[PDB]
């Protein structure tokens with residue numbers, strides 16, 4: 001029943017006061033984009049940075065298996081938008097947050113489906 | 116220097132026509148740095164400006180475009196250049212990248228290993244190479260044409276580049292190859308392009324635009340590299356990141372360029388003219404299959 005839990009290990013290293021994963025690939029873009037979370041091209045709005053997806057995926061970056069049956073990555077080959085105030089830790093952000101399945105924004109960071 | 120608002124500077128045609136002898140490269144602005152936008156890597160800025168310049172050429176952009184990117188890994192195990200290529204190329208473009216060292220990538224498929232172990236069944240529409248051997252910068256021995264990965268690259272162009280396809284191959288003062296220059300004469304047009312962000316470096320991208328498969332002009336590769344160094348030595352390029360701030364027209368324009376399969380005997384002067392204008396790709400359109408040769412030992 002043993003499985004490595006890297007998500008939990010990273011969250012705990014962050015809480016311990018560890019330096020977040022660096023060298024996430026930040027893109028140049030207009031910053032007039034839709035602001036959605038994970039897109040086929042950079043979509044950062046005025047409050048977001050856009051990064052190359054693979055460089056922000058914990059499983060990609062650590063060379064470990066993706067936690068799902070067929071091991072698919074939903075960041076690789078896409079761009080992930082990160083609020084500018086959290087862009088110092090894109091990996092942590094994507095791991096600790098969730099995408100609204102209806103509007104495509106980050107829940108709590110642009111998703112307005114609950115007001 | 117209205118050049119500072121361009122993505123970079125291309126080698127003027129009058130310098131291509133010279134017959135200079137090879138001198139040491141000595142750049143006036145050597146050691147200056149452009150100031151990059153906050154938190155932007157050199158490799159992202161550099162590939163952005165490369166793509167911005169390529170937007171001004173007659174690149175063939177077919178449906179289901181095929182792009183292969185050599186030398187794509189970084190020292191930190193990611194692929195910034197590939198990420199700019201994915202951003203630039205039309206959605207759905209098949210992008211394959213490769214490097215000697217392990218890295219994680221946004222490309223559709225990645226091969227790890229020396230490029231000489233890379234084989235593909237299909238032909239490609241655009242070949243990008245950032246490969247560079249840092250051992251090559253030995254200032255105390257003569258600067259002769261280098262082989263290594265350049266031998267692979269010339270063969271790869273000749274065998275696996277679609278007619279009408281294009282290339283961009285990084286060179287420097289000491290990392291260069293006479294046959295690659297001579298191959299530039301097999302395209303409808305060619306240049307050496309220096310990005311404004313890295314203009315303090317002798318690096319350039321040798322760009323071949325619209326491959327024709329036959330010599331259109333004869334080019335002496337030893338002379339042409341000497342011409343390139345002469346141009347660089349006498350034409351200081353002001354470092355600049357200006358173009359990085361306007362990305363509104365960055366994406367490569369979807370041209371829907373026609374793909375045809377043709378045998379060597381039916382490529383007339385009329386087809387050659389279509390190729391030369393970026394309006395025709397000649398290759399099959401089967402499945403894209405790639406592999407890496409693995410040597411087995413104890």
Ligand SMILES: Nc1ncnc2c1ncn2[C@@H]1O[C@H](CSCc2ccc(-c3ccccc3)c(C(=O)O)c2)[C@@H](O)[C@H]1O
Nearest residue numbers: 186187188189214215216228229230245246247248264
């Ligand atoms: N035969 C081959 N087959 C497959 N892959 C190959 C092959 N040969 C090379 N490579 C791969 O080329 C990729 C890019 S060259 C790495 C590089 C070079 C120079 C500088 C540099 C030097 C001086 C001043 C400023 C920058 C830097 C850097 O910015 O630190 C990085 C690497 O990842 C290499 O593994």
Ligand SMILES: [Zn+2]
Nearest residue numbers: 057059060073
């Ligand atoms: Zn991943």
Ligand SMILES: [Zn+2]
Nearest residue numbers: 100103111113
């Ligand atoms: Zn929502």
